Amino acid sequence: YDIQAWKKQCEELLNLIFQCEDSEPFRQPVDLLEYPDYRDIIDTPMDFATVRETLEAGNYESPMELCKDVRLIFSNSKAYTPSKRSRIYSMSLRLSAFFEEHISSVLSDYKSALRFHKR
Ligand SMILES: Cn1nnc2c1C[C@@H](C(=O)O)CC2
Protein backbone atom coordinates (compact mmCIF):
# COMPACT_ATOMS: atom_id res chain seq x y z
CA TYR A 1 0.00 0.00 0.00
CA ASP A 2 2.91 2.37 -0.74
CA ILE A 3 1.29 5.49 -2.25
CA GLN A 4 4.63 6.73 -3.65
CA ALA A 5 5.94 3.47 -5.20
CA TRP A 6 4.64 4.26 -8.68
CA LYS A 7 7.36 6.89 -9.23
CA LYS A 8 10.35 4.54 -9.08
CA GLN A 9 8.28 1.90 -10.94
CA CYS A 10 7.73 4.42 -13.74
CA GLU A 11 11.41 5.40 -13.76
CA GLU A 12 12.33 1.72 -14.17
CA LEU A 13 9.74 1.19 -16.91
CA LEU A 14 11.12 4.26 -18.74
CA ASN A 15 14.62 2.73 -18.44
CA LEU A 16 13.29 -0.45 -20.16
CA ILE A 17 11.62 1.66 -22.86
CA PHE A 18 14.85 3.59 -23.55
CA GLN A 19 16.70 0.27 -23.98
CA CYS A 20 14.05 -0.99 -26.52
CA GLU A 21 15.14 -0.38 -30.14
CA ASP A 22 11.48 0.41 -30.87
CA SER A 23 11.70 3.58 -28.76
CA GLU A 24 14.41 5.30 -30.83
CA PRO A 25 11.95 7.44 -32.94
CA PHE A 26 10.26 8.57 -29.72
CA ARG A 27 13.12 9.35 -27.31
CA GLN A 28 13.36 13.02 -28.25
CA PRO A 29 10.83 15.41 -29.80
CA VAL A 30 10.04 14.65 -33.48
CA ASP A 31 12.58 16.52 -35.62
CA LEU A 32 10.53 19.24 -37.37
CA LEU A 33 13.23 19.71 -40.03
CA GLU A 34 12.88 15.99 -40.98
CA TYR A 35 9.02 16.14 -40.90
CA PRO A 36 8.10 19.72 -41.93
CA ASP A 37 4.31 19.26 -41.80
CA TYR A 38 4.38 17.59 -38.31
CA ARG A 39 2.80 20.49 -36.42
CA ASP A 40 0.07 20.80 -39.13
CA ILE A 41 -1.27 17.42 -37.91
CA ILE A 42 -0.01 17.17 -34.33
CA ASP A 43 -1.25 19.68 -31.74
CA THR A 44 0.74 18.46 -28.77
CA PRO A 45 4.09 16.84 -29.39
CA MET A 46 5.25 14.37 -26.73
CA ASP A 47 8.30 12.11 -26.38
CA PHE A 48 9.85 9.85 -23.71
CA ALA A 49 12.59 12.32 -22.60
CA THR A 50 9.85 14.89 -21.86
CA VAL A 51 7.90 12.23 -19.89
CA ARG A 52 11.05 11.28 -17.91
CA GLU A 53 11.91 14.95 -17.25
CA THR A 54 8.37 15.72 -16.07
CA LEU A 55 8.52 12.71 -13.72
CA GLU A 56 11.99 13.62 -12.42
CA ALA A 57 10.96 17.26 -11.83
CA GLY A 58 8.14 16.04 -9.56
CA ASN A 59 5.53 17.35 -11.99
CA TYR A 60 3.32 14.23 -12.17
CA GLU A 61 0.89 13.76 -9.28
CA SER A 62 -0.06 10.19 -10.25
CA PRO A 63 0.92 7.40 -12.67
CA MET A 64 -2.38 8.08 -14.53
CA GLU A 65 -1.03 11.51 -15.57
CA LEU A 66 2.19 9.86 -16.80
CA CYS A 67 0.18 7.22 -18.66
CA LYS A 68 -1.87 10.00 -20.43
CA ASP A 69 1.39 11.56 -21.75
CA VAL A 70 2.87 8.19 -22.86
CA ARG A 71 -0.44 7.36 -24.61
CA LEU A 72 -0.15 10.73 -26.40
CA ILE A 73 3.24 9.64 -27.89
CA PHE A 74 1.42 6.66 -29.43
CA SER A 75 -1.71 8.55 -30.56
CA ASN A 76 0.52 11.19 -32.23
CA SER A 77 2.35 8.45 -34.18
CA LYS A 78 -0.99 6.96 -35.28
CA ALA A 79 -2.28 10.38 -36.37
CA TYR A 80 0.96 11.24 -38.22
CA THR A 81 1.43 7.93 -40.03
CA PRO A 82 0.71 7.98 -43.79
CA SER A 83 0.22 4.20 -43.55
CA LYS A 84 -0.79 1.81 -40.82
CA ARG A 85 2.10 -0.35 -42.11
CA SER A 86 4.83 2.37 -41.79
CA ARG A 87 8.11 1.44 -40.07
CA ILE A 88 7.86 4.07 -37.27
CA TYR A 89 4.13 3.44 -36.70
CA SER A 90 4.78 -0.34 -36.49
CA MET A 91 7.46 0.37 -33.83
CA SER A 92 4.94 2.53 -31.92
CA LEU A 93 2.43 -0.33 -31.82
CA ARG A 94 4.91 -2.80 -30.38
CA LEU A 95 6.15 -0.28 -27.86
CA SER A 96 2.56 0.59 -26.85
CA ALA A 97 1.77 -3.11 -26.19
CA PHE A 98 4.94 -3.40 -24.08
CA PHE A 99 4.08 -0.22 -22.12
CA GLU A 100 0.45 -1.25 -21.54
CA GLU A 101 1.46 -4.70 -20.30
CA HIS A 102 3.89 -3.19 -17.78
CA ILE A 103 1.92 -0.12 -16.59
CA SER A 104 -1.20 -2.14 -15.64
CA SER A 105 0.22 -3.30 -12.28
CA VAL A 106 1.66 0.15 -11.51
CA LEU A 107 -1.80 1.68 -11.89
CA SER A 108 -3.50 -1.13 -9.93
CA ASP A 109 -1.02 -0.88 -7.05
CA TYR A 110 -1.32 2.93 -6.89
CA LYS A 111 -5.13 2.81 -6.86
CA SER A 112 -5.10 0.06 -4.19
CA ALA A 113 -2.75 2.22 -2.07
CA LEU A 114 -5.10 5.21 -2.35
CA ARG A 115 -8.08 3.05 -1.37
CA PHE A 116 -6.29 1.68 1.68
CA HIS A 117 -5.35 5.21 2.74
CA LYS A 118 -8.96 6.36 2.37
CA ARG A 119 -10.22 3.34 4.41
C1 LIG B 1 7.97 11.00 -36.86
N1 LIG B 1 6.94 9.96 -36.82
N2 LIG B 1 6.27 9.58 -35.68
N3 LIG B 1 5.42 8.67 -36.00
C2 LIG B 1 5.50 8.40 -37.36
C3 LIG B 1 6.49 9.21 -37.90
C4 LIG B 1 6.92 9.24 -39.30
C5 LIG B 1 5.68 8.81 -40.11
C6 LIG B 1 6.10 8.79 -41.56
O1 LIG B 1 6.81 7.70 -41.88
O2 LIG B 1 5.89 9.63 -42.39
C7 LIG B 1 5.10 7.45 -39.62
C8 LIG B 1 4.68 7.46 -38.16
Swiss-Prot record:
Residues in Bromo domain copies: 1-106
Signal peptide: none
Modified residues (Phosphothreonine): T44
Tissue expression from the record: Expressed in myeloma and epidermoid carcinoma cell lines.
Residues recorded as bearing Phosphoserine in the entry: S90
Compartment(s) where it occurs, according to its Swiss-Prot or TrEMBL record: Nucleus
Function: Probable regulator of the insulin and insulin-like growth factor signaling pathways. Stimulates cell proliferation through regulation of cyclin transcription and has an anti-apoptotic activity through AKT1 phosphorylation and activation. Plays a role in the regulation of cell morphology and cytoskeletal organization.
Subunit structure: Interacts with IRS1 and IRS2. Interacts (via bromo domain) with acetylated lysine residues on histone H1.4, histone H3 and H4 (in vitro).
Disorder named in the UniProt entry: Chung-Jansen syndrome: An autosomal dominant disorder characterized by developmental delay, intellectual disability, autistic features, anxiety, hypotonia, obesity, and dysmorphic features.
Protein name listed in UniProt: PH-interacting protein
Portion of the full-length sequence here: 1316 to 1434 of 1821
